[PDB]
Symmetry: D3
């Protein structure tokens, strides 16, 4: 269990096994970007290869944005799907998941996308919003048929968030 | 008239007055990103402030992607609107524009977006696809009510593209 | 109250409300650069727009540099004004401010600059030096007539510094 | 045929089909780094995924370094193998190749490495040195059993180099 | 003679022997930053070590900034000295130099700085402004007692500037 | 005593006096790169000049890589010497050093390299591997005749590593 503090965003989280941070400037403004390592370990001290088709972004969800956590996660999930999967397609295999992060509750919206382009692998996106009983945080786990969202690990990641105090 | 070569993308273009390049790594793979300067000139040698709500991206449009140039620009324009304006809204003031870049023809799709969020300024996007009589290039000019797309300048930019030979 | 640790510089500080970190390489050598967010929140996970004409830099003040804290802040303030406002002008509205950071005392030097160029907004700079009773830290808050130095917040920032132990 | 100028290094070359530039700071000092695209095209304007286990570096070969071109390429090839494949192994399938770039001649040294680690794919490296009849340039193409050196394309790349005049 | 084009700035120049480019983002907005190599050549493909106390910056000099070229170079030289040598000192060994870049004339202002700090090496700065008979370009060569401005090479650099047409 | 946490790598260490961090992306994947400051302090807030010929890299040593700690450090030291000192030479002045980091033991391998090139300064490399009684970390301190490895400080750095819990 590797715990990571995000001081600007006011939270800590547990890094999922198999993932590293990428693009550390995210922390400057209270977010974090994670990538999934692939292949054999790199030379010591050098960055590991990471997958191209999956990513996790998490962070503080601005108070002015999105308004229950169920509605907020569904709305944020739709917006994230446009932002990261802009191509035409159809949503399938949708789910909503209740989140309970040590008392701070939330909700997540998951769906898969069958694209119009027959050559494109299906997309997958899990978007969670979790709050204290009013600071809020989001978790977005993006994947594909080839690197699927690990839904259990996405819930565990969101439920690992703790406010820094 | 400032002409800029993009060797990896196989084209040159005329830089619009008032714009500079940003994020030069775009050229590594045959694209270019431009930003609009704002304010007074910076100290000599230092980067100019640029606007936050408008941008131009242009580049070679991969042969496997998008299939007339009219259809290609409409499809690329829809995808670019999702990618850059992911929030819910309605398209208004749509236009299609014929392009003729020194014999190489093309088409552009323009639309404005009235967002559901009453506090968000309307979005604007112009997407052009232009080809030789089969290399193709795209031009996307993104703006808002506060920094509108200059449609004449967007057409001039797309019609300024020339293949490098 | 968001507290940020700067391990290389040996201090923590309270992030001012409305500010984020920029250019995280500053922390590699014991300094921090902050920028002021502007506009509506960005898309979640993306960096916020920041103001162009105001900035905060803080850090450990090297033992070989600058020698009371009153003299040190005045000298550092003059040097910072040259470095960040190199253009000809006149200092006006000067002030010196006593600092007391939980027992560790210091001083700050503030001044405004009326530039010779009538089209340039006046500049403003607040420079504080604070020490333990001999590690020392500096705080420089730069602004303009359009984004003024918040002198109360600058004093609060300097008086929020605590040594890491 | 996409020709790329490297002004600091004083040469141009033909970009191999299927490759893009990476890490453009190389050009600041007269070198170039290329990476091999993988997968489907990225969203227009965005960087393509590239392979992790193959790369090309080329550039001006400093006059003080390495001294026929046959000896120079063999020595540079040994050094490049240490730098990029530092792990213990055995060289196999060695070859030397004569180069003739429009009158400017040179030589290349190729070898494969069977590593001691049974789980590591074999390494492959092609190192060419080519000169005018005394400016010199190098080309290093690194690969593995999974992404082999394309020896014909490596020779074509080195023989595509032309001095800028 | 290595000629470098700066398309956004609308000029080309001759790279001084012994110098490389640094921080290529300068070209995005029409400027260039050069650094002086030190030591033995680096491993091929890797960046050369450069000196820490000398630099050249050149670029298009915005039409709204600075107004003969004699006055412009003196004013820009004073501002550049504040920006790059902010510490208290005295100017000594001042010179003004006429520039003639293939018909486009200009002027440069040089001075050395004896700092108040006895441990600081003297600073040196050469600032040139050159124009067509109304586009203008600047050249600033910064050095110290340990890496002096090469005044002949600075004049040659400014007189090497040619408009791109 | 400045202690630095590396959350992704699961350890903290004591920063050696005279060293700063460089290239902070190392922390994204559980490693750290340190550089040695040179010269007078930089302007406050600006990065210090660092030496070109010495560096420290440390990090978590992947469980699949390298298998006692004596053998692991010798093997990693050979690989690091190829990676960082690829040129032909002879090892001299070899040493092995036992490490005891607050109960977690390890070993280091040191050697100097006399290069074939008479103009190249001798190289020096110290490579340590230290473990809990099975997480492991490495420390590599690279130097030259002109900036030698400080062997006492390298041992102190490795023996300063503590797991984060």
């Amino acid at each position: 269990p590797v715990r990571i503090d995000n001081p600007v965003g006011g939270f800590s989280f547990a890094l999922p096994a198999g993932w590293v941070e990428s693009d550390a400037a995210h922390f400057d403004y209270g977010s974090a970007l994670l990538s999934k390592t692939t292949g054999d370990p790199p030379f010591p001290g050098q960055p590991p290869p990471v997958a191209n088709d999956t990513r996790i972004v998490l962070g503080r969800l601005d108070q002015k944005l999105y308004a229950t956590d169920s509605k907020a996660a569904a709305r944020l999930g739709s917006d994230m799907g446009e932002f990261y999967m802009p191509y035409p397609g159809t949503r399938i295999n949708q789910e909503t998941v209740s989140l309970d992060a040590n008392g701070v509750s939330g909700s997540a919206s998951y769906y898969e996308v069958k694209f119009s382009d027959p050559s494109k692998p299906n997309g997958q996106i899990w978007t969670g919003v979790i709050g204290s009983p009013p600071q809020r945080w989001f978790v977005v786990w993006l994947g594909t048929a080839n690197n699927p969202v690990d839904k259990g690990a996405a819930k565990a990641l969101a439920e690992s968030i703790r406010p820094l105090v």
